[PDB]
Symmetry: C3
Subunit: 278 residues, 3 copies
C-alpha cells in the first residue's frame, strides 16, 4: 500500500469545546467561541489515544456531551442521571479513551475502538437530548486503526429528521471533488425517522471501513443503506472511479423524503474544473 | 479457558403452556401458573432435536411458531397448515437443528446456530398480531460447538413502544458485576422500527456479537436498527474499559426514549456499589 | 463444486427495452412492445460485461432508466438534471458497465460490481421517479462474479409501499418449486415504508450472495431482514432443505402489513407434485 495509512495511536490529546446558541435559534458545538458549526467539528483519533475535552456550556440551559463507541467512565457519560451534564456557563472536563483490539486473558478477542462514531447532547429539551439534537448539537468522531487508509478529505452527512445537516430543504449541502480524489464520508442519522442513504455512481462495502480488505472480504457491496436514529457509518470512495466526472446526486431514497428536499450533489470535476453539462 | 458449548445431537423434551394472565396479557411458560413475558428461554446445541408438548390453556386458538430452526410444515404453527391448537388442546411441536457442512454439490450448508425466537401465529389475526401484542413471544438460542458461554443471559424485546410489555419508564433493569460475561438476546415485534443502543459498551454486528480474531471484518457497533421479528444477540464484558456505573440502554428513536423505552444496565463494583449511589 | 457456476465476463451485450403505460393505469418496462411487466424483466450479466440498452419511451410523459450498483457515466444516470431522461415517444441508448475486483495502483482493493441490484424510473411524477416507481417502473439486475453458484430459477419479490409487485392485497404472488430445487430470490423495496422480509422454513446468509463461502464465513444467518426504499438483496435456498414439502409462507413481518395483505406462498412440492395438506 502506497496510500497514506494511519499510525499507531497512544497519545494523550487535549481539546477545548463549546456549546453555543446560534442567532437563528439553533445550537452548535465548536472548538472556538463564535465558531460553532452544525454538524459540530470532526474529532479524529487513533486507537489507543486518550482525549481530554474541556467543555464549556455558554448557553442558558444545561447541556452535555455524550459519545458513541469510545470508552468513557460513568462520570463522562453526559447524562443528568449520572451528574455528567454542565450547568449554564459552566465548564467540565470529559475524558474519552480508545483501545486497540487484542487477546484477553481468557483467550477471547477484545474488539478495538476503531470506527465511525459520533457525539451529541443528552440533556437539552429532554433527558435524552431530543431538543439539543434537534437544534444541531451533534458531530462526527473517527477512530482509526493502525494501517487504515487515509482520505484526501472527509465530509459529514447527517440526516436529522427530514433535513441534511439541519439545512433548509433542497439546499444540499453540495461538495466538490476531482476525479480520482479519495473522498471519505461520515454518515450519521438522528431524530425520529428511518432513512436510506443513496449515492449515484458510487458504491462501498457495508463493513467498518467501507473498504474491502481484499478478495477474501465477504462484506456486501452496496450503494443504498438503511439507517435509523444514532446509527453511524462511514466509507471512502474514489471520486468518479469507472464513471467519470459529473454532478452525482446523493439523497435519502425514501421517495417522500427525496421529494421534500433530502438531496445534495457530489460534484466531481474534470482535471480542468468542469462538470459535464455545467 | 472460557467455557464453550459442546457438540450437540441430543433429543430433548419440553412441556410448554400458553396462559391468559390476570391483567389480560398472554404468556408462555414451562409450568402452569409460571408463564412469563417474554416467555422462557430455550437453549440448544446445533444437532439437537426438541420435542415440545404444547398445551393451550386459553379460550382461543393459539400456536407456537419459531424462526431459524428446522421444522416440518406440521410444526409451522399456522392455521393455514393446521398446526395451531384449539382451546384446551395439546399438540407436540418438533424443532430440529443441524450443523454446517459440505453438500454433495460442494456448496456449504449453513448451520442453525444463532439468536432466534418463537411466538404465536394465530391469536387476533392469522399472523399472531394479537398474541404477539399480548406477550406470546420468547427467545431461542442455538449454539455452535465452541461458542463462548456467558455468565448470564438477559432478554430484551422491543414490542411496539414497550420493553418486554412493561409500562413506560419501568425498565427492565439488569444487574452485573464489573467483569461479568453478560449475554443479551434482542428481539423486536409489532409495528415500529427501533434502534437499540447501550451506553458504555459495544459489540460485533455478526452472528455471535463477538469477533473471531484479527481477521474478522464485522463492524463494531453500539447502535443497531431493528424491525419486527428481527433477532440478534451479543456478549459483553460488563464495564470493560469503562468501570462500574448505571449504564443506560434504550431505543434511540428520540420520541421512543422520551416516551419510556429506557432501562438500566447496573454494573456494580466488587463491593456491590454503583458510582453515584 | 459440481453445481453450475458463472463464467468470466467481458462481453458486450445489446438490449432493447420499452416503457409502456398499461391499460389499468400502471406503467411497466419490457423487452418487447406489448410484453411489459411489473416487476420489469430481469437483466443478468457477468462482471466485466458491458450492456447497451436502447430504451424507447412509448408513454405520453418523460421517463427514464436509472440503475443501482453498476458503472455508468453521467449521461446514463437517468435524471432530468443531467439531461438523461427520454421525451414521450423518444429513444435513447443507455450504457451500463461492470468490472471485476482487483488491486489498484496504490495497493488498495477495488470492489467489483457483483451483486443483487435493480433499475427504476427517475422522472415520472417527480424528479425522483416517485410516480413512476409507484406505477410499476422497477426491475431486478443481477451481476454475477466468476464462480458464483447458479440457481435453477430466479424469482423477484418487490415490496412497493404496501404491495408485493404492485399486486392487490392478499394475492401473493405465489411461487412453486420441488423439494431440492436451488431457488434464487431477488428482494427489492421501494416507496415510503420500511419492511421486514421473512420466509418460513428457510434461512440465508446476510452477505452479498446469501450463501456462506465455507466454515470461515462470519456472516450472520437470518430468516428476517429489515429493508427500506431502494434496498436490494438476494439469496439462494435449497427448497425444503431439512424441512420438506409444504406451503411455506413468506411475508413482511410488520404485523399491520402482513394483516393488510403483504403475504405470499413458496409452494414446495414433493416429487409427486403434492403439497402436504392439499
Ligand atoms: Cu442515551
Ligand atoms: Cu429519509
Ligand atoms: Cu441511484
Ligand atoms: Cu446517542
Ligand atoms: Cu409468518
Ligand atoms: Cu423505538
Ligand atoms: Cu449513548
Ligand atoms: Cu415470526
Ligand atoms: Cu436518485
Ligand atoms: Cu411491510
Ligand atoms: Cu416465521
Ligand atoms: Cu434508486
Ligand atoms: O444516547
Ligand atoms: O411469522
Ligand atoms: O435514485
Amino acid at each position: 500500500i502506497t496510500a497514506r495509512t494511519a499510525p499507531a495511536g497512544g497519545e494523550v490529546r487535549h481539546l477545548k469545546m463549546y456549546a453555543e446558541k446560534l442567532a437563528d435559534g439553533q445550537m452548535g458545538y465548536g472548538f472556538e467561541k463564535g465558531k460553532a458549526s452544525v454538524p459540530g467539528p470532526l474529532i479524529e483519533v487513533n486507537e489507543g489515544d486518550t482525549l481530554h475535552i474541556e467543555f464549556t456550556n455558554t448557553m442558558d440551559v444545561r447541556a452535555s456531551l455524550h459519545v458513541h463507541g469510545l470508552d468513557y467512565e460513568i462520570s463522562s457519560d453526559g447524562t443528568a442521571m449520572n451528574k455528567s451534564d454542565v450547568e449554564p456557563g459552566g465548564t467540565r472536563t470529559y475524558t474519552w479513551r480508545t483501545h486497540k483490539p487484542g487477546r484477553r486473558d481468557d483467550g477471547t478477542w477484545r474488539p478495538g475502538s476503531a470506527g465511525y462514531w459520533h457525539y451529541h447532547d443528552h440533556v437539552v429539551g429532554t433527558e435524552h437530548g431530543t431538543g439539543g439534537i434537534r437544534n444541531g448539537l451533534y458531530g462526527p468522531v473517527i477512530v482509526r486503526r493502525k494501517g487504515d487508509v487515509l482520505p484526501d478529505a472527509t465530509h459529514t452527512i447527517v440526516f436529522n429528521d427530514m433535513t441534511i445537516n439541519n439545512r433548509k430543504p433542497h439546499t444540499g449541502p453540495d461538495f466538490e471533488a476531482t476525479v480520482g480524489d479519495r473522498v471519505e464520508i461520515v454518515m450519521i442519522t438522528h431524530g425520529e425517522y428511518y432513512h436510506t442513504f443513496h449515492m449515484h455512481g458510487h458504491r462501498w462495502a457495508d463493513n467498518r471501513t467501507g473498504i474491502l480488505t481484499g478478495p477474501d472480504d465477504p462484506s456486501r457491496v452496496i450503494d443504498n443503506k438503511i439507517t435509523g436514529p444514532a446509527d453511524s457509518f462511514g466509507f471512502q470512495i474514489i471520486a468518479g472511479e469507472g464513471v467519470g466526472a459529473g454532478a452525482w446526486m446523493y439523497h435519502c431514497h425514501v421517495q417522500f423524503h427525496s421529494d421534500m428536499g433530502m438531496v445534495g450533489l457530489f460534484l466531481v470535476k474534470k482535471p480542468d474544473g468542469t462538470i459535464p453539462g455545467y
